[PDB]
Amino acid sequence: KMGGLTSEQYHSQVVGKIGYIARCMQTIDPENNLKKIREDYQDVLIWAEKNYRFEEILEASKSGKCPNDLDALSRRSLILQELLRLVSSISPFKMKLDLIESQYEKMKQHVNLWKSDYHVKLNQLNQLTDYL
Amino acid sequence: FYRLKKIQEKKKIIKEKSEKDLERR
Amino acid sequence: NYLSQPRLTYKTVSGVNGPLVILDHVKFPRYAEIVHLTLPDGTKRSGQVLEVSGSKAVVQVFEGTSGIDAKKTSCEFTGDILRTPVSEDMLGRVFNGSGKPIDRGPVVLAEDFLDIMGQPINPQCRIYPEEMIQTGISAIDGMNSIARGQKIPIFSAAGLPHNEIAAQICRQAGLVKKENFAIVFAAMGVNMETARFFKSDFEENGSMDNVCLFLNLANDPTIERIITPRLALTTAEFLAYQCEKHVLVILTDMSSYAEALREVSAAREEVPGRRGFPGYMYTDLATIYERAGRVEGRNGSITQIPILTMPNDDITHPIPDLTGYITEGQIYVDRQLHNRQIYPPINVLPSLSRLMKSAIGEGMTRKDHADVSNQLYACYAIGKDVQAMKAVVGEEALTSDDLLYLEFLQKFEKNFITQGPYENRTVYETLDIGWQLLRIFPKEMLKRIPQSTLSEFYPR
Amino acid sequence: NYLSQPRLTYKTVSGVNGPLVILDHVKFPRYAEIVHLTLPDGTKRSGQVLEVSGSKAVVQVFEGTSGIDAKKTSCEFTGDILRTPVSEDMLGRVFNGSGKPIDRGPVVLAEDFLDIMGQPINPQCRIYPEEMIQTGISAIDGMNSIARGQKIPIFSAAGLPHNEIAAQICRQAGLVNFAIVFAAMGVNMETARFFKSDFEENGSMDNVCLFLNLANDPTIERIITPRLALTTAEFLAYQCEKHVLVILTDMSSYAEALREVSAAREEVPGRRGFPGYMYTDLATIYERAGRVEGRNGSITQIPILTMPNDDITHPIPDLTGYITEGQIYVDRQLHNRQIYPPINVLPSLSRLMKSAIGEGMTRKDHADVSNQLYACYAIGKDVQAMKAVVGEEALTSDDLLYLEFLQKFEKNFITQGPYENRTVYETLDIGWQLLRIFPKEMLKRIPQSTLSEFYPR
Amino acid sequence: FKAKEAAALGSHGSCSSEVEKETQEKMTILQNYFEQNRDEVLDNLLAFVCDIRPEIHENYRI
Amino acid sequence: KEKQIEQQKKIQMSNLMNQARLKVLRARDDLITDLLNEAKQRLSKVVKDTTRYQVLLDGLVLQGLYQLLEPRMIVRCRKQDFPLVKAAVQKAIPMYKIATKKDVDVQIDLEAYLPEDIAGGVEIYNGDRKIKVSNTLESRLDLIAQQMMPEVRGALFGANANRKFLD
Amino acid sequence: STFGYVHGVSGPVVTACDMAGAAMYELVRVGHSELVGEIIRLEGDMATIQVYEETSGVSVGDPVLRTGKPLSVELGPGIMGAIFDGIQRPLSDISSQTQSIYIPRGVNVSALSRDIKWEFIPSKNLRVGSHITGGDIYGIVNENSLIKHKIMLPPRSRGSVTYIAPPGNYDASDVVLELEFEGVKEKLSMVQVWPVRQVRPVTEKLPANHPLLTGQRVLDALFPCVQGGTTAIPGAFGCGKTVISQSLSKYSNSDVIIYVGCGERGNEMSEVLRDFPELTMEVDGKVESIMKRTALVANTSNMPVAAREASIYTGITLSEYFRDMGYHVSMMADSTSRWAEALREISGRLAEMPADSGYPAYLGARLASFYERAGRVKCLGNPEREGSVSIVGAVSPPGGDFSDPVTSATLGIVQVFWGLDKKLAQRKHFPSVNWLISYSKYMRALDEYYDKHFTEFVPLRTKAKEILQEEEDLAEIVQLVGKASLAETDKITLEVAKLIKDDFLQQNGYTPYDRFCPFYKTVGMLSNMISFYDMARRAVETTAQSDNKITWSIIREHMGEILYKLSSMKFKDPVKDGEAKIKADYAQLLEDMQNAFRSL
Ligand SMILES: Nc1ncnc2c1ncn2[C@@H]1O[C@H](COP(=O)(O)OP(=O)(O)O)[C@@H](O)[C@H]1O
Ligand SMILES: [Mg+2]
Secondary structure (H helix, E strand, O other): EOEEEHHHHHHHHHHHHHHHHHHHHHOOOOOHHHHHHHHHHHHHHHHOOOOOHHHHHHHHHHOOOOOOHHHHHHHHHHHHHHHHHHHHHHHOOOOOHHHHHHHHHHOOOOOOOHHHHHHHHHHHHHHHHHHO | OOOOOHHHHHHHHHHHHHHHHHHOO | OOOOOOOEEEEEEEEEEEEEEOOOOOOOOOOOOOEEEEEEOEEEEEEEEEEOOOEEEEEEEEEOOOOEEEOOEEEHHHHHHHHOEEEHOOOEEEEEOOOOOOOOOOOOOEEEEEEEEOOOOHHEEOOOOOOEEEEEHHHOOOOEEEOOOOOOEEEEOOOOOHHHHHHHHHHOOOOOOOOOOOEEEEEEEEHHHHHHHHHHHHHHOOOOHHEEEEEOOOOOOOEEEHHHHHHHHHHHHHHHHHOOOEEEEOOOOOHHHHHHHHHOOOOOOOOHHHHHHHOOOOOHHHHHHHHEEEOOOOOOEEEEEEEEEEEHHOOOHHHHHHHOOOOOOOEEEEEHHHHHHOOOOOOOOOEEEEHHHHEEEOOOOOOOOHHHHHHHHHHHHHHHHHHHHHHHHOHHOOHHHHHHHHHHHHHHHHHHHHHHHOOOOOOOHHHHHHEEEEEEOOOOOOOOOHHHHHHHHHOO | OOOOOOOOOOOEEEEEEOOOOOOOOOOOOEEEHHHHHOOOOOEEEEEEEEEEEEEEEEEEEOOOOOOOOOOEEEEEEEEEOEEEEOOHHHHOOOEEEOOOEEOOOOOOOOOOOOOOOOEEEEOEEOOOOOOOOOOOOOOOOOHOEEEEEEEOOOOOOOOOOOOHHHHHHHHHHHOOEEEEEEEEEEEEEHHHHHHHHHHHHHHOOOHEEEEEEEOOOOOOHHHHHHHHHHHHHHHHHHOOOOEEEEEOOHHHHHHHHHHHHHHHHOOOOOOHHEOOOOOHHHHHHHOOOEEOOOOEEEEEEEEEEHHHHHOOOOOHHHHOOOOOOOOEEEEEHHHHOOOOOOEEEOOEEOOOOOHOOOOOOOOOOOHHHHHHHHHHHHHHHHHHHHHHOOOOOOOOOOHHHHHHHHHHHHHHHOOHHHHHHHHHHHHHHHHHHHHOOOOOOHOOOOOOHHHHHHHOO | OOOHHHHHHHHHHHHHHHHHHHHHHHHHHHHHHHHHHHHHHHHHHHHHHHHOOOOOOOOOOO | HHHHHHHHHHHHHHHHHHHHHHHHHHHHHHHHHHHHHHHHHHHHHHHHHHHHHHHHHHHHHHHHHHOOOEEEEEEEEEHHHHHHHHHHHHHHHHHHHHOOOOOOOEEOOOOEEOOOOOOOOOEEEOOOEEEEEEHHHHHHHHHHHHOOHHHHHHHOOOOOOOOOOOO | OOOEEEEEEEEEEEEEEEOOOOOOOOOOOOOOOOOOEEEEEEEOOEEEEEEOOOOOOOEEEEEEEEEEOOEEEEEEEOOOOOOOEOOOHHHHHHHHHHHHOOOOOOOOOHHEEEEEEEEEEOOOOOOOOOOEOOOEEEEEEOOOEEEEOOEEEEOOOEEEEEEEOEEEEEEOOOOEEEEEEEOOEEEOOOOEEEOOOOOOOOOEOOOOOOEEOOHHHHHOOOOOEOOEEEEEEEEEOOOHHHHHHHHHHOOOOOEHHHOOOOOOHHHHHHHHHHHHHOOOOOOOOOOHHHHOOOOOOOOOOOOOOOOOHHHHHHHHHHHHHOOOOOOOOOEEOOOOOHHHHHHHHHHHHOOOOOOOHHOOOOOHHHHHHHHHOOOOEEOOOOOOOOOEEEEEEEEEEEOOOOOOOOHHHHHHHOOEEOEOOOHHOOOOOOOOOOOOOOOOOOOOOOHHHHHHHHOOOOHHHHHHHHHHHHHHHHHHHHHHOOOOOOOOHHHHHHHHHHHHHOOOOOOOOOOOOOOOOOOHHHHHHHHHHHHHHHHHHHHHHHHHOOOOOOOHHHHHHHHHHHHHHOOOHHHHOOOOOOOOHHHHHHHHHHHHHHHHHHOO
């Protein structure tokens, strides 16, 4: 038992978050413009982008070579998701890179981002956008 | 009373199995 | 001195029934031996031999019997009884009811292997406990005072705050001052909210490096509860009697332990005791509760605080009834006080400590402690007898003396028993709050107190 | 297709014990099969296979095991479960509790043979019951209103006038005809004569079917008697599209016969020694009622209970109240006072009343009147209990209003007499004549719109 | 408020470095004592593994 | 508000020290795992020294037979080792008859073999295969090593200074 | 072997032989009609089987088809708006195929229809070579206008995507994903399958912080529940256990409702199927029927007794599957006593040794592990969502006695207890909740919610519990002594407790103004009743020392219109009247009573 999970489930969910963080990073910034964020995520973005296989990053997770704390990966993963929601909610318009890095840093410093009024304001934009 | 019966039955079954084993021996 | 001989593996399962697997063709079967079962999908389970007869052996399976089959499931007999690994490195770790890690740490690298049943300590080699623990709670430290090495359970019921009482004792307990505890904590059948509450409080108190947790939750298998208290107490005996620590042991529902014993005894078709429980349940609970105290020439101790939930609030039920015949008193938590929002809801009348008589008094605490304790108890008993009369006859029938007892009873519940979850009263604060309530009466009514104690302490 | 292979007959009886006979060397035994026994004196009996294992079959004999032996007793196995012959020619007939005629008529020609157990109706195919039956009795129609397709038993006790209530309902019931299926378990000859007389006297007997088991008839017939009746009701309602009213007399005798059978099998006891499965058994009787989608018939059930020592918490009324859509409660204290019908509203219920009443159903006030009569009767009963401690001199003027309402309600609303037949509208206007005893500000269940329209009259 | 939050974060960030330094000291001490003793331990393990000595169960009767 | 800063600080300090204990505990476990990997490698050299491997395999066969005690037994081996186990069985049978005072039939399984990945040793089965005894070198190494754990702790990392009594 | 044979039959229990390889809790099919049952004991080559269909007419030597699988549920689009039996057969498709009013024994119909086409949209960012793990949402189905049905990777499935279906219309049998892990391919459709006796995994379980709103004034004010909570409703017959369960199912803040009716009436499942399609919630200024968010599991009191257990596990497995989409689900169990009663018959026919009242010794562990499946969670898989299941279980203690083994085990587990009273039900006092015995453990978790949204409320809740507890202490004296000795503050306390008991704690669920009570109406009503109490108590307590002084009888004669207005607050209708109109009226009552006390 690791967390609430079997060890096989736990290490499979670690491979899943390393994969999902890569898909988020590629869709917030298709161009490598976002240098400070790509440095803060470098530990997980080293395993993606390179040619690799699910069973190899699973062995690296079991061996402790990649990041393998699901609590740290959940926190890291949510900050890109809540950034990507802002960037995707604001569809035709675009934010300045200085403002994007400011929103990221203001999110990263938050105690529990899921409770934030940032999360609520994005729920309200998605509620308006989903209707339209 | 219901729990003290059923013990009597399970004991009777054990005796009958033991008697059948003594008929096998 | 090792078992260097190969393990026999059998595919000779002959029946599966409730928690039990039955094997035949077993070679010289051993009572209480451990068995490892491998199911056809490659899952592994563990179990213990409950009965042997010729080539036949009966195994209880700790993780249950679902998916077991009589043809492909195989059992490896380990040649030995259940010995747990032990070490001092077990402090600051979290384990399940089988003693397997759940903190994402490694398995225990043993300092020794100990039989989970322990070894009988000679009655000649025990030391009588007399060091008072100040728990910080006035209803305990004043009137049900606890000696280091005692066993004293919390008797409670469904919906009552017994977990808050136990956690407050873990925060506040220490010796009386005119050393600190290692904590071993066993959960049998608790909900996730209870497991989170205790674990979070040890993290927030900052003391999580001096506690060992064994957790079996209400979704974990019932048959692990048979061994969970025994893993906790085998860990406490290593820490106390080899590493010379002072250990406080918490066993958080002995009612769920007793229910798991009834599952196995019913499945074995044994002659029932009262309420369907095993006829050997006194002897079984005694092998858990008597694993406490102090020993000659070793500077360590084990104190036990079991916790019970009484079904239908009934103290005459087998679980609390047998427990009172083994433990040195009880602390009773009352729905009547809880419905009035008194906290702690401790009812001092059915509560007892059997070791306080020698842990209190001059040089131990203070010379008045026994006299205040007796007089407060007597007044509260008389106050309940007055209150039960008044509820029929109405207040106009009462004497001035009856109104003194009725005032004392209200003041005693508001000031002495009510306390709050982080307030830490000393014995001396507790005893002086006691005198401020005994001040409700003239000296002629304080008949349990000798005239020297009245003369010295009443006029202050 | 037919069972066209022969029937096997066995002299292989291997044990006899209580109501049970055990046979061995039986060829492929069938669970719940029917067996015919011929005794050494040539008497015929029938039983049902209650357990099978290998070549052994355990059969329970409906008429009992006295005079059966191992050597000479001969058992014929039918190849099938218990099925009853059914036709509309069963209306205007009398049968005993095993379905055999007792009217000097012939045996039934079957339009079909039906399994006595029936089959559970799919909850998606059920139609919710909503058409109010007017019984003509104010305590039922105004405060426990009955919908066509309901289960609503009479909870009574020994010596109370519950047969007279059931006969008055059979006589007076209509909507705001019924075919009647009547079952008796363990009744005396006076009770059998009363119902038969009442049906013949009201000229109604061409539309009635009677299954009778008396206090001197076999006790295991009682467990098939109500299942023969309900199988007949299902043909009439769901194949011939009739509206059927089903009366089951002493479910207390059924439940005691069930306890007698289950005790003889050494099965798990529930409360007061009743079978551990009695709820599930009674549910197979009471759930055989209601309406279905696309068919124009219905079954309404009115079972009758005797509560032992008048105790509603006894297992029989207790497990019945968990299954049925309410109850009508007959009270010894009203009967001792010579009120009739002795119906006490407070322990009584109708679960289907809530949506069988109101605008276009009955009258718009009906729910508000009913709930305010419940509130005033309950407070009047609490004043009557209080006045026994403190005496009349301690009562306030408000207490004397509830105590006047209590006395007028039992004389005017509840008391009625055995052939008086009131409309719902008469019942509701008697209701308002009693509610106006109070100022409108005391009528706190009723909204101002209902008060302002109906109270000034 | 903000000064107390910054003081908590500065204290925490300081303690995290010392906790890692002490961890690296402890892990170094384990790696030293392991490599100093590995050979003597393996030479005992294989001396147990390779020395079989067959036996019948003592409850066996001819 | 203010107490949440104290709670966050306390919890974070508790989490830091917990994670630091788990690092040093995993460090021991990984070093112990490396030693057991080296023991498996060291045993593979004893297997390739076929003069010693016969002396081991003579013992591995006879020790399996003395655990089973059946009238008829089936021996399963790694395919490379067949001539060595056939010699071992031929030595085992007369020792078995002398020690047990009862007859035996022993057959090497020619139809199925232990995998070529196995370091060495045998398995022995009852004549219906519903009982077996496993006597591979990985089975011995594990069975021995787990019982040695208090002694490999004491040798690799030293005795606990706090443990005043062993009884 | 693939078949055993029936060796013997006794009620719902069958023994079979030639079953030697069969595992504990496999499904089997028994007889020539192929009745479903589950293996419950093993001995030699024999198996004992618990059958989920009636065994009447089954013969010795009949076949017993051995299936390599436990009891499981099909999970996918087509669950919302459906009704199923306890083993997940769809009762509307059974009606459509048979053209008859009955369920045939041994009937098979696929649980989710394979003929219906569903609009599937793949999740944009997934491409060939994407790494994916169990619980990952890979597309969405537009199941209806109220529920979007997320399609997600099965737990215990993982790999690299080799195919992903384009936007389109698909059958439940069409492959929508392919992936590989060990170099072996897996192919997936919109339907997965899960064992009902196994808990569906989660990333983490969370503390429950947000209320579950019932629309009752009692319950929502006095005895709260939470999203992720556990509740029991014990009572005698006819107390309201069904009406509370249906009202909470109609009007609450949950996203999805699962309703299980095991061992209860067929007319009540018919009632929900009549009532819920006609009843609408409002979304984007548009109405939607509450049946679009609802699923029913039926096994009525005359259906097979062993299928009551199947209903319970089916219902919570359907509930966990929607929790895993990031929904808040409520599961109703319309009586847990009926499942305990099924455990007892099977235990009796297996000839086991009983615990209390004949129930099996494992009963408490069955209940405790069922209620542990509730909670608030972080889901598995990577869109980083949260969801919950709340469980509300009715209990039917025989004779109304709460010392019942099922009630007594249940109250050892659940965090909320709504104890119903037959003496309230006989007065037509509904909901019949006994406010002296009932409790909630969640009242501290909800502190931060009320301290943000309803900052006046916790003081009013506290005063109301004290007035009701003071009246209970007075009433025992009043019954023996005859009321005349009371102080004027005690006569006030009795009258205001009577006002609360009659006009706050009481609702008719079958009338338009009290069908549902909003929390603004609830806090507003309690505020005015507690305000009148504090003013009446102040007027008496201030003047009682003077030669001329106020009494409750003076207040009654001076304020009969305000007392009548206070009793009439309940009649205001939350959809005929506005929120603004109701709050303005309750503010006007406060001015009217303040002007009356100024006149004293
Ligand atoms: N809140 C309510 N409002 C109005 N009537 C109610 C209410 N609760 C219960 N009832 C009435 O009481 C009957 C019994 O309720 P029900 O839920 O079926 O009882 P239970 O399940 O406890 O046996 C209902 O059919 C209805 O007539
Ligand atoms: Mg109900």
